[PDB]
């Protein structure tokens, strides 16, 4: 059906509609060009003074998110779990036969 | 407000409430709603920049006074039907003119980035052909159609002045009959075996039922044989659509639908 | 019900269709007529040719338009 | 609502023409790809005349 | 007593399942139909057969797509 | 409940697929104790159908639906408000409102 | 509060209810849900860890 | 009418039990039909014999895989 006509006046119509497309994207595909996945956290505001602005901060516009993003790694940083099997996705590698990792290994 | 604030952290800023005067008057410079109108233009291009974010506000500049093409795509996708059976399914004079003239050639209303999303803020036109008040007939029988069919934004849809009310609500109607009152429904999937069921349809002479598919054709003909009067089961149907629906607003197509059939 | 054309109230008549599309409609006089409650009712003589009465009775099955753009009638 | 004038009259001819314009839609075919249709014969020619014109 | 097709609507046909677990579909006209007027009036006909005419007895009740995909038809 | 698709066929599609499970269960013998049931080999016609497939096989459905004019049977249409109807208190916009005011009527 | 109240009892601590004000904005920071995801992914591995609450 | 098994049958099988402590089960045509209210309107064949006309004749106060089990049928 390429092609429709006025069945009176007998000429053409081509039937359209506006473009619209938003195509979707596969977890595999960022697989492709980066091999890592970067995480812009790091402040040198010293470890101990961070946990007292996301606390006093906490009440209203106080606490920017960079307070809270620092912080965060702060505590969790350190390391722990000993790997008791094996870890590998999308062609990359976590851990091996029994590391120890954390959750800052990404 | 919280959209462009990325963590800046304010409070309330437009003091008194709006009386149309500190507020909507902001948009009559034609150099200023260009300048809403390139911003939404380029960062169509790519919306990945850092600063795509501008689109927050520049958005509704894209196909404002353009509802008519609007509507189309909706139907199109409430109906299921091609980019191209609906218009063969279109049966009104009226409604056929203003369809003529939304379709004109050479006027790039179905090319990714174009100017032509923004002609009314771009100044490019002051009276847009696509407009749902020059297209004032596709409007209401597109409309009525969609929401006959179970069509959630139809109901708040704006009901035109000066039309063929009449002419244009049975074939809405119909047409909404013959996509209801059949459906696609074909096996799609398999593993081994599967329903065949090519050149299957009417051994005969049982029929009197609505024809097979959906050829504007087929129905036109069996709408001849019931004396051209909409059959109860049709009436029923409607009813049955806009019943239980509720806190409809005025002037709507919904309200409209609602008094129409509903009872 | 004693008419001249009437005794045709069994015989086949077979329409070709588009191609192998579709099939034959297998029509006769006494799927579109019960006895005189509607063709001893609307336009019914016994001069009526067999094709010319057949096709009036088109209307009783809701199908002769419906029944208009697909076979040769 | 006018005054003085002829109400059980107008509204009877109103009332027609209003039944008229209702009872029959324009509906025909407006756009197509090989297809159509056109009615032709049998159109009125078949007894059936007695629902309105 | 009318037609011809009709007067074997006593003797059955038998259609050959089409798996492991089914017996075949032993069927009769005067099973399928209610009586005469019925078999006309849903577009019988004297100029049959058996098998084209006990499918037109499958359908009327809604059961042909069914064996269609059941049975060897 | 989604925006912009084929609201009258989608759901057609899903009555029929849901009177298919609901309609037909599993239903069979697990344990025993020396004796049990069975009935693979032992079903007969012959003009003794007029009713809905038995299991859940999506090929033979299909033709009894094609059987049905292609249209929603009243007791397959009586399901669903069975189905829907004595749910209370939906929200606005959601599936559940959609069924109800689809179905129960 | 049930959980964020593990051994040392502490109540409500932001004022202003979400409302989009206070911890709005954070699950827009590409650095905050990306650390969320981390953290949630790591303890999905070690469901029996001692932190994995 | 011209059938062998219709309305002259009235023969009781033996039908063993397999429970140890019950009495056979013995059955005719008319505890599982009627006259013309279930033979015209679903199922049976004339050309069967007195098994095939009591196996699908046994559905009527609805019983078959319940005497199945129950009973050697």
Known sequence: SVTVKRIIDNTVIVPKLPANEDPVEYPADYFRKSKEIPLYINTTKSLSDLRGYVYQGLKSGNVSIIHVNSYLYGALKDIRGKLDKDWSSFGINIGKAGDTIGIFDL | LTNQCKMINEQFEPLVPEGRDIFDVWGNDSNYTKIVAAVDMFFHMFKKHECASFRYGTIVSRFKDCAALATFGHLCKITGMSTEDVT????????????????????????????????????????????????????????????????????????????????????GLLYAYAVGSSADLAQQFCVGDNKYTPDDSTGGLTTNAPPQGRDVVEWLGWFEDQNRKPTPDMMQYAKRAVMSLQGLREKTIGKYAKSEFDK | AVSDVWSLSKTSMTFQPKKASLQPLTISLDELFSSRGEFISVGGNGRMSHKEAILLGLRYKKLYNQARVKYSL
């Open chain 2, 88 to 171: 063969t399914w279109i049966l009104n004079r009226e409604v056929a003119d203003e369809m003529v003239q939304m379709m004109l050639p050479g006027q790039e209303i179905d090319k990714a980035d174009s100017y032509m999303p923004y002609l009314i803020d771009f100044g490019l036109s002051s009276k847009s052909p696509y407009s749902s008040v020059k297209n004032p007939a596709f409007h209401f029988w597109g409309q009525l159609t969609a929401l006959l069919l179970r069509s959630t934004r139809a109901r708040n849809a704006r009901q035109p002045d000066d039309i063929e009310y009449t002419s244009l609500t049975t074939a």
